[PDB]
Write an enzyme that holds these catalytic residues in place. Structure first.
Site, PDB file in Angstrom:
ATOM      1  N   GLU A  49       0.806  -1.219   0.000  1.00 32.57           N
ATOM      2  CA  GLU A  49       0.000   0.000   0.000  1.00 32.57           C
ATOM      3  C   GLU A  49       0.846   1.279   0.000  1.00 32.57           C
ATOM      4  OE1 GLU A  49      -3.634   2.175   2.506  1.00 32.57           O
ATOM      5  OE2 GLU A  49      -2.700   0.345   3.279  1.00 32.57           O
ATOM      6  N   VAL A  50       0.379   2.283  -0.734  1.00 38.03           N
ATOM      7  CA  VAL A  50       1.045   3.579  -0.790  1.00 38.03           C
ATOM      8  C   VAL A  50       0.126   4.686  -0.275  1.00 38.03           C
ATOM      9  CG1 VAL A  50       2.274   5.231  -2.227  1.00 38.03           C
ATOM     10  CG2 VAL A  50       2.307   2.789  -2.816  1.00 38.03           C
ATOM     11  N   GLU A  93       3.080  13.113  -8.650  1.00 39.84           N
ATOM     12  CA  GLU A  93       1.712  13.620  -8.706  1.00 39.84           C
ATOM     13  C   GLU A  93       0.897  13.031  -9.852  1.00 39.84           C
ATOM     14  OE1 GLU A  93       2.804  18.174  -7.884  1.00 39.84           O
ATOM     15  OE2 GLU A  93       1.416  17.263  -6.438  1.00 39.84           O
ATOM     16  N   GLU A 152       9.616  10.245  -2.809  1.00 32.80           N
ATOM     17  CA  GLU A 152       9.083  11.354  -3.570  1.00 32.80           C
ATOM     18  C   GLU A 152       7.638  11.075  -3.976  1.00 32.80           C
ATOM     19  OE1 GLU A 152      12.611  12.986  -6.178  1.00 32.80           O
ATOM     20  OE2 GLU A 152      12.462  10.804  -6.471  1.00 32.80           O
ATOM     21  N   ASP A 171      11.084  -6.724 -12.531  1.00 24.35           N
ATOM     22  CA  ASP A 171       9.631  -6.715 -12.387  1.00 24.35           C
ATOM     23  C   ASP A 171       9.013  -5.433 -12.949  1.00 24.35           C
ATOM     24  OD1 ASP A 171       7.120  -7.715 -11.618  1.00 24.35           O
ATOM     25  OD2 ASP A 171       7.218  -6.697  -9.688  1.00 24.35           O
ATOM     26  N   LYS A 230       6.749  -3.052 -14.789  1.00 23.67           N
ATOM     27  CA  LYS A 230       5.377  -3.065 -15.309  1.00 23.67           C
ATOM     28  C   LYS A 230       4.821  -1.644 -15.295  1.00 23.67           C
ATOM     29  CE  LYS A 230       3.832  -5.615 -12.072  1.00 23.67           C
ATOM     30  NZ  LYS A 230       5.093  -5.564 -11.272  1.00 23.67           N
ATOM     31  N   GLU A 235       2.627  -0.348 -13.644  1.00 18.37           N
ATOM     32  CA  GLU A 235       2.353   0.136 -12.290  1.00 18.37           C
ATOM     33  C   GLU A 235       3.611   0.539 -11.501  1.00 18.37           C
ATOM     34  OE1 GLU A 235       0.485  -4.030 -12.472  1.00 18.37           O
ATOM     35  OE2 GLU A 235       1.327  -2.659 -13.953  1.00 18.37           O
ATOM     36  N   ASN A 236       4.789   0.233 -12.041  1.00 18.50           N
ATOM     37  CA  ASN A 236       6.058   0.621 -11.411  1.00 18.50           C
ATOM     38  C   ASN A 236       6.699   1.780 -12.143  1.00 18.50           C
ATOM     39  OD1 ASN A 236       6.434  -2.810 -11.866  1.00 18.50           O
ATOM     40  ND2 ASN A 236       5.649  -1.902  -9.962  1.00 18.50           N
ATOM     41  N   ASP A 279       9.759   0.551  -7.158  1.00 21.88           N
ATOM     42  CA  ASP A 279       9.492  -0.838  -6.737  1.00 21.88           C
ATOM     43  C   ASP A 279      10.610  -1.825  -7.076  1.00 21.88           C
ATOM     44  OD1 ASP A 279       7.023   0.021  -5.674  1.00 21.88           O
ATOM     45  OD2 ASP A 279       6.024  -0.311  -7.610  1.00 21.88           O
ATOM     46  N   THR A 301      39.650 -27.016 -10.698  1.00 18.21           N
ATOM     47  CA  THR A 301      39.957 -28.308 -11.298  1.00 18.21           C
ATOM     48  C   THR A 301      38.862 -28.668 -12.304  1.00 18.21           C
ATOM     49  OG1 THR A 301      40.709 -28.890  -9.039  1.00 18.21           O
ATOM     50  CG2 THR A 301      40.992 -30.557 -10.756  1.00 18.21           C
TER      51      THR A 301
HETATM   52  C1  LIG Z   1       3.744  -0.351  -5.258  1.00 19.02           C
HETATM   53  N1  LIG Z   1       3.664  -0.111  -6.694  1.00 19.02           N
HETATM   54  C2  LIG Z   1       2.634  -0.924  -7.334  1.00 19.02           C
HETATM   55  C3  LIG Z   1       3.445   1.309  -6.999  1.00 19.02           C
HETATM   56  C4  LIG Z   1       4.103   2.369  -6.091  1.00 19.02           C
HETATM   57  N2  LIG Z   1       3.597   3.757  -6.227  1.00 19.02           N
HETATM   58  C5  LIG Z   1       4.383   4.892  -5.730  1.00 19.02           C
HETATM   59  O1  LIG Z   1       5.483   4.741  -5.300  1.00 19.02           O
HETATM   60  C6  LIG Z   1       3.753   6.299  -5.848  1.00 19.02           C
HETATM   61  C7  LIG Z   1       2.393   6.408  -6.221  1.00 19.02           C
HETATM   62  C8  LIG Z   1       1.811   7.691  -6.367  1.00 19.02           C
HETATM   63  C9  LIG Z   1       0.478   7.852  -6.766  1.00 19.02           C
HETATM   64  S1  LIG Z   1      -0.531   6.701  -7.302  1.00 19.02           S
HETATM   65  C10 LIG Z   1      -1.908   7.401  -7.635  1.00 19.02           C
HETATM   66  C11 LIG Z   1      -1.768   8.921  -7.333  1.00 19.02           C
HETATM   67  C12 LIG Z   1      -0.267   9.187  -6.798  1.00 19.02           C
HETATM   68  O2  LIG Z   1       0.148  10.507  -6.449  1.00 19.02           O
HETATM   69  C13 LIG Z   1      -0.768  11.552  -6.888  1.00 19.02           C
HETATM   70  C14 LIG Z   1      -2.259  11.174  -6.708  1.00 19.02           C
HETATM   71  O3  LIG Z   1      -2.660  10.024  -7.470  1.00 19.02           O
HETATM   72  C15 LIG Z   1       2.618   8.886  -6.118  1.00 19.02           C
HETATM   73  N3  LIG Z   1       3.971   8.776  -5.736  1.00 19.02           N
HETATM   74  C16 LIG Z   1       4.556   7.501  -5.589  1.00 19.02           C
HETATM   75  N4  LIG Z   1       5.939   7.407  -5.162  1.00 19.02           N
END
Ligand SMILES: CN(C)CCNC(=O)c1cc(-c2scc3c2OCCO3)cnc1N
Length: 287
Positions: free
Chosen positions: A21-22, A81, A78, A123, A125, A127-128, A144, A162
């Site tokens: 979770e973030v 946004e 960090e 890894d 993707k 989402e990273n 990630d 050897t």
């Molecule tokens: C764990 N992995 C799947 C993703 C990690 N996400 C972050 O590190 C991260 C996410 C965000 C996000 S995600 C959706 C958002 C947002 O920020 C602005 C509002 O809308 C931001 N900073 C990150 N380091």
């Protein structure tokens, strides 16, 4: 439920979930926003992730701001946004080719920088991949690193020995050793495929060939209708990245030399975005 660790509360005010979770948080000292990744207790992946992020320094790679080892692990990063690249490509959403190129260029730079530094991500993707703002022209950072590996010392030592007793399979493995980094280039190809087309190269959707068979054969689902919209240069690069043989697969350097990336406009835009991000921290210096 449960409470945040006291040392965390001491420095940050926790806020809304961003993904799972973030969490969004506010650093008290600066009143600025940060993102806090919560990892439920594990130690191995977290220890390496942290040690890697601390040592790396690149504009397209996320930085670590703080770390709390408590009931759970807390990694302060960090705040990006713009959120995840994933949200831009889900539901067959597609990025315009010029945007794909700006993002992909930065992905390439990040992964090139990883490989030069003996790190594989393993890894990668959508989402990273994080976006720095809600504008479609923006910086990206990779994040990630929990599944990352640090670059054959065992084999090399084994070779100095050897030879008499060395097992066939060990000698056979010599042919391919040192190409583990190629998995990241495969991942980049899949990501690029998805950004350009709005759909995955390999999936079980409307097909009878197993996902596995698709992948090892390298036979991606080519839908001419969708790709008609895309340049032949873009598609050519994808093809060089989705190469089944890891030794023939394009490296990041080859990808960066590809005609699709010889685009001085795109590069100017990136360089512009870089300088903009940096204005707030740039000190004066010797003329
Ligand atoms: C764990 N992995 C799947 C993703 C990690 N996400 C972050 O590190 C991260 C996410 C965000 C996000 S995600 C959706 C958002 C947002 O920020 C602005 C509002 O809308 C931001 N900073 C990150 N380091």
């Amino acid at each position: 439920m449960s409470v945040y660790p006291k040392a965390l509360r001491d420095e940050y005010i926790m806020s809304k979930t961003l993904g799972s979770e973030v969490k969004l948080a506010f650093e008290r000292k600066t009143c600025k926003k940060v993102a806090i990744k919560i990892i439920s207790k594990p130690a191995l992946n977290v220890e390496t992730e942290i040690e890697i992020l601390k040592k790396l320094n690149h504009p397209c790679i996320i930085k670590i701001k703080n770390f709390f080892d408590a009931e759970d692990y807390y990694i302060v990063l960090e705040l990006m946004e713009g959120g995840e690249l994933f949200d831009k490509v889900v539901g067959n959403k597609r990025l315009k080719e010029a945007t794909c190129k700006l993002y992909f260029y930065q992905m390439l730079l990040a992964v090139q920088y990883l490989h030069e530094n003996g790190i594989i991500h393993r890894d990668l993707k959508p989402e990273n991949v994080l976006l720095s703002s809600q504008e479609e022209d923006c910086l990206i950072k990779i994040t990630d690193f929990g599944h990352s590996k640090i670059l054959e010392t065992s084999l090399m030592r084994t070779l100095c020995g050897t030879p008499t007793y060395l097992a066939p399979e060990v000698l056979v493995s010599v042919g391919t050793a040192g190409y583990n980094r190629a998995v990241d280039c495969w991942s980049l190809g899949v990501i690029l495929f998805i950004c350009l087309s709005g759909y995955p190269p390999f999936s079980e959707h409307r097909t009878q060939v197993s996902l596995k068979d698709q992948i090892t054969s390298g036979k991606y689902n080519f839908i001419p209708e969708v790709w008609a919209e895309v340049s032949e240069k873009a598609l050519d690069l994808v093809k060089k990245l989705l190469v089944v043989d890891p030794k023939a697969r394009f490296t990041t350097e080859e990808a960066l030399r590809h005609p699709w990336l010889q685009d001085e406009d795109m590069k100017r835009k990136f360089q512009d975005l870089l300088s903009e991000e940096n204005e707030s921290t740039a000190l004066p210096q010797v003329l």
